[PDB]
Amino acid sequence: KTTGIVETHFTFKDLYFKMFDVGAQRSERKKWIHCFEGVTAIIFCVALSDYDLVLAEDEEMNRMHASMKLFDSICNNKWFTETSIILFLNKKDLFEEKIKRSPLTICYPEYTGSNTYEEAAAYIQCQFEDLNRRKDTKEIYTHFTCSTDTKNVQFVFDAVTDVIIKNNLKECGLY
């Protein structure tokens, strides 16, 4: 019925999680971007299959470049200096299917090498993880989605636990 922020709630191993989806706002990001300060982690999603898809429909903008630009803008905000990012590279089946039909070299002028999933994934990831510059305070966790099993929830739970532990140690001053 209502538009705007959508909230989903679930409990995993006695931890209560809250997730806010802000994709329906369609307004200036800066005005509402200072309201979300204080979150524990930021979940970020990227599709590998957009390398050879002109999703944007603009010749100048390729979906991968747009995703990289958005990730760069989000990661280096003044407010989110100390919030970690859980990066989810998604759709690894179709991407692996199309690599041999059209290699990864279309997106980047530099060669990925070998035209196969392991090498291609490494090049796309390294290129996404190098966008950050506050390496001292924030870190990125990367998981390739697995549909059948529950690796998706467990990875988020473990990442949140690690973030909480590292936050407490830093406050004590030990870390």
Partner: peptide, 7 residues
């Protein structure tokens, strides 16, 4: 058990 995939 939560570590980033090796770069």
């Amino acid at each position: 058990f939560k570590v980033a995939a090796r770069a």
